[PDB]
Design a protein around this ligand. Sequence first.
Ligand SMILES: Nc1nc2c(ncn2[C@@H]2O[C@H](COP(=O)(O)OP(=O)(O)OP(=O)(O)O)[C@@H](O)[C@H]2O)c(=O)[nH]1
Ligand SMILES: Nc1ncnc2c1ncn2[C@@H]1O[C@H](COP(=O)(O)OP(=O)(O)CP(=O)(O)O)[C@@H](O)[C@H]1O
Ligand SMILES: Nc1nc2c(ncn2[C@@H]2O[C@H](COP(=O)(O)OP(=O)(O)O)[C@@H](O)[C@H]2O)c(=O)[nH]1
Ligand SMILES: CCOc1ccccc1/N=C(\C)C1=C(O)C[C@H](c2ccccc2)CC1=O
Ligand SMILES: [Ca+2]
Ligand SMILES: [Ca+2]
Ligand SMILES: [Ca+2]
Ligand SMILES: [Ca+2]
Ligand SMILES: [Mg+2]
Ligand SMILES: [Mg+2]
Ligand SMILES: [Mg+2]
Lengths: 424, 349, 438, 53
Amino acid sequence: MREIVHIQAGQCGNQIGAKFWEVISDEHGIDPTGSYHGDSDLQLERINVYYNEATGNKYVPRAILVDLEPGTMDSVRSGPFGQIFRPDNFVFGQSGAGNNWAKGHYTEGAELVDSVLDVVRKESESCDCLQGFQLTHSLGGGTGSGMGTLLISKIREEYPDRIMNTFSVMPSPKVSDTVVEPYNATLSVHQLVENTDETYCIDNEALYDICFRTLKLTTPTYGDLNHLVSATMSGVTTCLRFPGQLNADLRKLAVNMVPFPRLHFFMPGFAPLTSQYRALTVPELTQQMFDSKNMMAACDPRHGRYLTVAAIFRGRMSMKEVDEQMLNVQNKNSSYFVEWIPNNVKTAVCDIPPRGLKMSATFIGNSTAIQELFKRISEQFTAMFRRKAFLHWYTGEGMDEMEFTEAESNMNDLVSEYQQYQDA
Amino acid sequence: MYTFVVRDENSSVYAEVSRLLLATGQWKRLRKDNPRFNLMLGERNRLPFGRLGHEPGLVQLVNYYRGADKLCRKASLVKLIKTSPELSESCTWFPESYVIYPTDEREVFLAAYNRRREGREGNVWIAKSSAGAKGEGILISSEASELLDFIDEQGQVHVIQKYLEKPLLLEPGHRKFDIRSWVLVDHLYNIYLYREGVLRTSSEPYNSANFQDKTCHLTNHCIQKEYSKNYGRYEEGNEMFFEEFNQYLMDALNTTLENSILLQIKHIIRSCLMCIEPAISTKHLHYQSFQLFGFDFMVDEELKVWLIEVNGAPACAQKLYAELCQGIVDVAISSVFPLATSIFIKLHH
Amino acid sequence: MRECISIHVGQAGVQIGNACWELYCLEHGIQPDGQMPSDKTIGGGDDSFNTFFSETGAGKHVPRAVFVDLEPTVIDEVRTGTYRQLFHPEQLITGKEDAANNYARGHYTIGKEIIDLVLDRIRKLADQCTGLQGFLVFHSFGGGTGSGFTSLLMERLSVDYGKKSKLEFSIYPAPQVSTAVVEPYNSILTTHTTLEHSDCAFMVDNEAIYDICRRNLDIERPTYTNLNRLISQIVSSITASLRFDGALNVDLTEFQTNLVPYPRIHFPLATYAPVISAEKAYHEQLSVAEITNACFEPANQMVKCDPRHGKYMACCLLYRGDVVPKDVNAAIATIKTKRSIQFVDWCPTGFKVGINYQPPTVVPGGDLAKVQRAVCMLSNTTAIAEAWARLDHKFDLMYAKRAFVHWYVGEGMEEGEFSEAREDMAALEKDYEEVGVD
Amino acid sequence: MEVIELNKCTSGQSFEVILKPPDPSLEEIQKKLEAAEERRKYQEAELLKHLAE
Ligand SMILES: Nc1nc2c(ncn2[C@@H]2O[C@H](COP(=O)(O)OP(=O)(O)OP(=O)(O)O)[C@@H](O)[C@H]2O)c(=O)[nH]1
Ligand SMILES: Nc1ncnc2c1ncn2[C@@H]1O[C@H](COP(=O)(O)OP(=O)(O)CP(=O)(O)O)[C@@H](O)[C@H]1O
Ligand SMILES: Nc1nc2c(ncn2[C@@H]2O[C@H](COP(=O)(O)OP(=O)(O)O)[C@@H](O)[C@H]2O)c(=O)[nH]1
Ligand SMILES: CCOc1ccccc1/N=C(\C)C1=C(O)C[C@H](c2ccccc2)CC1=O
Ligand SMILES: [Ca+2]
Ligand SMILES: [Ca+2]
Ligand SMILES: [Ca+2]
Ligand SMILES: [Ca+2]
Ligand SMILES: [Mg+2]
Ligand SMILES: [Mg+2]
Ligand SMILES: [Mg+2]
């Protein structure tokens, strides 16, 4: 019951997804070979949300690993927890996607997508009651971006009433692989606007700035960025994976967090982020959680307004103190919550802390300030598209300029729709 | 930090209270429709009391007592005084009054009137209404038929009241007046009488023979400025304050303001507010109330004090806003929401 | 003897129902296995407690109850809990996937597929009844199942059992104990659709129960288990007249007769006293005068509101424990001289009193101390409209921006049902005002 | 202050004290449910049409 099917696509999607499974396998007591060796039946009460139980008391991630080249998945298979994944769930091609949304969505990815859906269908059919899908991917490349959104469209066709949530890494010129990332991201965002229920926007510049300024890492790597993402993903999903206050499937959660269908792009954060054995008080946890420096979309929440907010606290702490502190941040931030959604700040506590911390807090904001992220992408897109720069990479795969024009308009409409609810 | 909302822009008192709260640096004003406030400076009419005290974790305070209108409506005050045994139909400090509709007391009103004029007694009455503002819907007359015919012309319910035919007259001038006292009732139902009151004086000689010129008979500030050509002659703005009035009583009548008048005023304020306390107290409620009241009194030539009306949303005398509004913040607001020699007389009970 | 069937819908309805039947068993001397040693008629009934319990030939006493949820984890706790032997499997109905806090999903999408099965299981209980009086329906306002499927069940119950009374125990939504945001929508939608089908409805605001548990039970952070045990005490006080010998409120019809002069205005206010912490070492027992006076404190009401600023249409006093009529009347006389109690002009200023000599039963190991006497007051006061005004205002705020509306339209509901329901609530607020203000 | 209707039994007693004297058919439900199911089906058909484009 309430099984989730996880999909990770492309280089970024698989490297972050692998870290996610390392983190929650540790929390659930599952060793790198799928055997349970924990000390508490709380670790197993909801283990089925993310794991299948194979005979021999082995637990197998309900995870599908997709790429258009073999390199990253070879690395996953050799990784720390590489053995826990079902071998049949590695679906990969050989050509690559050349950081090209069109190859991922229209040519190379189109050839591979049916076999991915075969594995999805096989995992779904073994679910007592599938509650939905999650995808990890970046928007700036070709496989995660183009083929990932092709996958989402195909899943919506085959499973039209299943929830689809994403953890989506947004490109930034400061943490960039190629100049075409704004093209790929803009084309992808319109797919997400139509076909996901919640999209967690993780901006690579925010991750970099946190590593550099807060964690005092002089030269951050993708691995350092990915440790922030897997820890955030663990926190965001804490209430599905462990007993606690929330008795909610993905649909109930989306119903209460998404007041308008297109405005489902979430700003996540968590606390603490520290460079260490010091105890964090509830005031400190609550204050850091709402601080823009602890959020991961590189948007200032004071530049917009919160439609809905959820916060998950992990560890043994005073519920009464949590309530008091959540009221203190709301009165300091009273301007920044819409007054036409009553009681739009919700909290949940889970007694089980993450590894290495006595307590932590995860933040889920649906804020109109996320429009700043789409404005950045739109600007970078237009700066090149105005001169049709680098377009030949896409027209060579059969796309024409009109589809770029339409993706630009769709993103500017999304920005415009955020601005209208920020002024209400 | 504390949060408050303003919903009566026309309040001179609470525009000044709101100004003081900001100048503290510990109060923040929100939009008028933000429900996450600590203090509501509410609207005069249809204040949504049913929505207060349901915001989790916020202690909520409002500057009006739900139910205090019974004291602050003319028809309602008459019914409260006649039917409450604490006050009773024999209450010695409220003029004989009757409620009349165009229940109704028209037959009882004429009954006491018949005994009055038949006995060659003074039979002048003043008919007034709550819905009549600016001193327009007032009629003073000794003929009952004229009073009753006047009421049916106007649309609203009216109160006919014995007109104090022997009022204490200030000298020189042979002139009428009324006393305004400001009373603050906090969330604990302490009753605080502001030590400063004001006399709203007539600048015309009182003329018992002719009631048609209402200017010498009506002490309203708007009426004296509008119609009395002697406005401001004896005192600025036809407002005399307690130091002068007390000095006058000492020089002329060899008595004090405290002894001859203020003991009765305190007695009357206490009686009215103690009467309705069970109906309006917020002591064990999910939100708290305070309210500022304006009591209006008349004094006769025997130095007997009579209650005239109670205003639930009073203004203040110009030269007293700073002191009283600070006192509201001190006693009524900061007492619930503390921040990081007293101007009130506490009437005990 | 006339049977009553209890129906528990959604998480709140199921968990409260579980708490109520536990208490009923304690009050009637029924063990968790269904046996009842004091019942000397084996397999045969006609006693007052048989209005709620049927009997098997093996002598087990089975609740006349149906539990229905669109998702199984709450009813699974009934299936494996202390009183699992009480219920037979056919009384416990579960779906695969819940209504996601969406009225339209509980009413239209999922309700359509399970309503006939639920009515079939209810019919099976009705067939064991020699003279069914009607139904007691427990549910939340805020849940998708509690609101959406309840309104559908209530409509079909009016069809299939047209001459039967239906009473509700409804949990009114409180932000302190809810992680949902759309509950004002579900509450107005279900109240609009259920209004004509409910003869009498007892609203319990989780905010009031939560604060009573904090102040009187010294529970810093009350849980659903704390709230439900308190709620079950109040429910037991209200249903005790149906389960024990007596002459007041002995059938469901009497609830409407004594408490509801106007059909639409059928939401009596419940007030309960005393609530005393069991952890409290030294406690002085409260008198009849003291618990009766406590019935006029807003802090003891199931819904926070101010009855001093409304008018009463009916008032019922339900005492359990060491109480005699003489002390009730002495207490009433003193309270009438000290408190603002105004009735409407077309009703007598009076109190219907019932006294049951058995003091309240409390769950062993629970939060409530045993007391020598307790009282539940049921008053139909126009002050409860304050709770409608609160809810309607939160509705208006969200609906002016059409926030969350697409979730409901997406399940096949039309936007016009929102405004149709809100207009019904506007008429209801107006009805209370016409009755209660001069 | 009058007591009336005093009834007494072994379990307790009841009385009154006075201070002062003074639907849709089954077919219609089915219509509603089937109409909503059809609006769901029409919305889904538009989604599937949109995906087919
Ligand atoms: N007093 C009390 N309230 C509850 C309980 N469970 C849920 N609630 C309240 O009910 C509302 C949520 O509705 P639920 O009953 O959980 O939802 P549901 O009826 O199961 O319908 P679904 O949406 O399908 O899950 C919130 O206001 C909760 O605070 C309970 O056990 N006791
Ligand atoms: N019974 C009476 N005898 C003598 N004078 C009277 C009287 N009733 C009223 N007055 C005079 O009429 C004036 C205004 O009366 P009233 O207070 O009823 O009107 P109002 O409410 O519009 C002014 P305010 O709001 O400041 O009290 C008083 O200042 C007083 O001088
Ligand atoms: N945070 C993070 N970002 C990555 C990682 N790998 C690539 N990226 C970002 O993802 C985008 C490139 O997409 P990538 O996943 O490598 O291409 P794909 O394999 O075709 O899907 C760029 O914006 C990179 O900055 C990673 O491991 N972590
Ligand atoms: C209705 C309010 O809900 C909450 C209230 C308080 C605290 C946390 C809450 N939880 C939310 C919002 C939530 C979500 O919206 C979706 C999250 C998710 C995302 C991606 C994959 C899987 C799960 C899982 C998840 O806990
Ligand atoms: Ca190929
Ligand atoms: Ca095929
Ligand atoms: Ca028997
Ligand atoms: Ca009916
Ligand atoms: Mg790459
Ligand atoms: Mg006035
Ligand atoms: Mg449920």
